[PDB]
Amino acid sequence: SRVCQVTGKRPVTGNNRSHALNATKRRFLPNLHSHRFWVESEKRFVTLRVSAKGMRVIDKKGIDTVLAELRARGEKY
Amino acid sequence: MKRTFQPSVLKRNRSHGFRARMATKNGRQVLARRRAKGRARLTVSK
Amino acid sequence: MKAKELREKSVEELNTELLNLLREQFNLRMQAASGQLQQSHLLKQVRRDVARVKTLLNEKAGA
Amino acid sequence: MIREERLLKVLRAPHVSEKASTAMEKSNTIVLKVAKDATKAEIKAAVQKLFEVEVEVVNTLVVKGKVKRHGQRIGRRSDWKKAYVTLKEGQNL
RNA sequence: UAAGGUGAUAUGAACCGUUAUAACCGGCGAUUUCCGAAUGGGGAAACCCAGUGUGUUUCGACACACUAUCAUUAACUGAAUCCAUAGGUUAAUGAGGCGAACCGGGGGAACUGAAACAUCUAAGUACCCCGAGGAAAAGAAAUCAACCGAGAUUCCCCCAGUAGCGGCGAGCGAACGGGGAGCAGCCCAGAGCCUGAAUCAGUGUGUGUGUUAGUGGAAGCGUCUGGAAAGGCGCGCGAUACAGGGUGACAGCCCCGUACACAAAAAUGCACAUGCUGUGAGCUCGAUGAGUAGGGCGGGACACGUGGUAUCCUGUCUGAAUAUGGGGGGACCAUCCUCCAAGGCUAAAUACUCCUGACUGACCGAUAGUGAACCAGUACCGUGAGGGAAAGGCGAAAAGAAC
RNA sequence: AGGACCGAACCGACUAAUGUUGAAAAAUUAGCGGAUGACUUGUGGCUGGGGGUGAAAGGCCAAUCAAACCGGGAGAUAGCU
RNA sequence: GCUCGCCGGAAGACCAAGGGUUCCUGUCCAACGUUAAUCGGGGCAGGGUGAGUCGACCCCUAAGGCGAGGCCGAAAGGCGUAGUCGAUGGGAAACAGGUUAAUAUUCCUGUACUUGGUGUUACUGCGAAGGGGGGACGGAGAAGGCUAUGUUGGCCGGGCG
RNA sequence: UACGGUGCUGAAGCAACAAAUGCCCUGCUUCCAGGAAAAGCCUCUAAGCAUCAGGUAACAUCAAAUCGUACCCCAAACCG
């Protein structure tokens, strides 16, 4: 799965559809990249998987209000 | 004459044997369906 | 050692099984070879009875 | 220790063999019954601990299947073991 | 609770008896070989082979108690590389497998109808997958109406075969809202005043009453027939008890029972009262969420099909306002009402069964009813998924075959 | 030396005959032939459904196959029987 | 019991898969072997399966399967580097005498040896999950030195019709 | 003892020649299609260690888990 590790964006069910009367499945897949961040509480760099719409959130909110509260129990990152 | 099945408890226990079936989702489901029909044997090699 | 005592080490009830079962149950079935008693249905004399010694070996008091 | 008496729960009633018992049961060689483990090393310890005689030979084997044991059901003797003991100078066990 | 028992084919010896473990049962709580989550590693239906640590001894091989994976918590160690950290080790918690049916999410048809076919219908069915609770799911508004106002959701009868959609075909098919079942709403964006006041769960108890081991409870005799009656007859008597079942042909009066009535080691449901812990009744004043709503483009879910197409999800780019502000009201605009997102949670009225209990059938009776009342999913067929029988009823009693 | 001439073991299908409710789910009897190869073979694996495998017949894929077999939608549909 | 016949590279001997009480004595003759059955792999009992060295295990591992950490996938499932199974391969341990109704490189006899410990005697650097040699791999042909195998003679015992 | 089986004893026990589909052979020689790995084994050193332990030749003496084991077989015991 192409998961945006910084937001939980996953693939979704959906149809292609065009100007045609016959309708066929698509299932929307994300574009998937990596990005590296600094954690001032652990004084180390970490690498996370990122995607469109999701990578737009973290840069806007700030890592000290996103990545600094992202662990649900630890997730070994 | 020759038969398409020749007797072999080694290759029967490899395809249809209890642990061999159990080690696959579908073979473990054959065993679940054996229990649903109530078949007295779950292996015919041992 | 004896049932009037409290919180002794439970491990000594394994020697009770040495005395009361290991030195008894085979001789009970073998004395027939010395011409003695010769009946076979006698194992009730250690069966169900020695289970109470094992229950006391498995006891936590004094361990 | 080495070797402890805690293992000597071994052996059962006398047994019969045409190969020994019918000429040696009172003079040199006897046959006995056992559990599912025949306890090959502890047989001779259990003889030394009960009858104080040294052992010269020990065999146990395993006897298998053998047909019919019921007049209306399936029945067998299945897998079962024995003990065949020969004495060093002892006679009558 | 109880005197006959030690399961049955099964008898006998032996063994408890009848007296403070006889058998039988209720409570809780041990014992639980090997396979099997299987947890050292390997693997094969019941098998195979190691390690860590300690001890013992002819220091010829014994044998405890422990070692999985993932996530988190701590403690020591630690590579490139100092410090560090990956990596290594040790202790702890959480998960693992199983269990009937229901249930959220995911993958997703064809047939069928359109007397023909693709859109539409059929169907988010069928089947497969993931995951989980005693229910799952929903919720008290940037919702719904229409100037009247509603004030959660679900379930039921309806609204309505109407609106709306629709090759303007076949047909799919509402909402508003009524009658009903069933009624708990709150907090964060933030502080004080009030005083621990309302309400609910948990836990030490109490009381009332059930549940899991129970024993008491009224009357029928004679005579005849028959090998034998629960029958005929004489009539007699009980009934808050004429229900099953059992006993040798029809039992209200023979047995287990019924109506009617209690009793308590331990475990435990319902309801009344109470302590404790956690939550905190009431008053008052602030304050109203910016990478996500819009906007272009495209899907999904809407009863609703590309149309003049609102709304809510959602892929992608892009990204906002402050009271002469913002969302919505099914094109769009104004006016106007209503809500104010961009934070989190929710009663069971509903769904269901392996199980527990009560009730019931104008149910069948050995080819019936399940294929299966019977050592049946056995025999038997196929390499395999998967197919698949024959076969019940001597008698009241074993008295069952001597001589 | 040999994709060489004949030829046991080994292999094997071409002709002929017998068999054909059989001994038989393809054999038997006789012969011609393959036998260092582009071969054959013991043992265990790997290739699957419009997919496999094929010096390639839509042949072979456990007797089945212009699309295998079992179980389901399925008691689908039949202006007909 | 005497006699005959056929097979004799099988119609024989040994090993294995696969099956499973079949072995032997002791009896039984309903059913079975499409019969007779006194036989029997049939009925029903009783007896029988003796291993340090044999086949397996050991230790390594090919094809292939599984597969961590890691990756792909809603997911069933799968990729791939360690690791772990696995030989059809590479690696320690017994021969031929005669015995039992039925067993045997399993017994008893004689003789032999590998593994592990301890004692004896002389000489002594042993050692990675690392380094080297080996293990270790095709097809065919042709030299050397032989042995099972077999007869003659020798030698032995028997015979002389 | 039992002509009943069950033991004891015991003659000769050689080389001449041909050699099988078997050895020396994982050979030698030749060839193009140029033909598994690893561990045991032997050997090198690191680590570590000492009249040890390990390494070699010759020996005495004690010990040696577990699986398998009955029977058939080009076939009446496999399968048809």
Q: What is the structure's resolution, reported in angstroms to one decimal?
A: 12.0
Q: How far apart are the first and last CA of chain C?
A: 13
Give me C36's structure tokens. 């003695």
Q: Which strand (E) or helix (H) includes residue D87?
A: strand D80-87
With beta carbons less than 8 A apart as the criterion, state whether D87 and D53 touch: yes
Q: Who among D13, D30, D46 is closest to C32 (CB)?
A: D13
A36 Cβ contact list (under 8 Å, min separation 6): A45, A46, A47, A48
Experimentally, how was this structure solved?
A: cryo-EM
Range(s) of the domain holding residue B38: 1-46
Distance CA B21, CA B29 (A): 9
Q: How far apart are the first and last CA of chain D?
A: 28
Asked if D50's CB is within 8 angstroms of C22's CB, the reply is no
DSSP state of C55: H
* Chain C interface mutation, best of D3, D7, D12, highest count of C Cβ atoms under 10 Å: D12
D38 Cβ contact list (under 8 Å, min separation 6): D60, D62, D81, D82, D83
Chains in contact with chain D (at least 3 beta-carbon pairs closer than 8 A): C
Minimum CA–CA partner of C24 in chain D = D9
> Total structural domains in chain B?
1
**Burial, B20: exposed, middle or buried (Cβ in 10 Å; 0-12, 13-18, 19+)?**
middle
Q: At B33, which CATH number?
A: 1.10.287.3980
With beta carbons less than 8 A apart as the criterion, state whether D89 and D54 touch: yes
Distance CA B4, CA C4 (A): 77
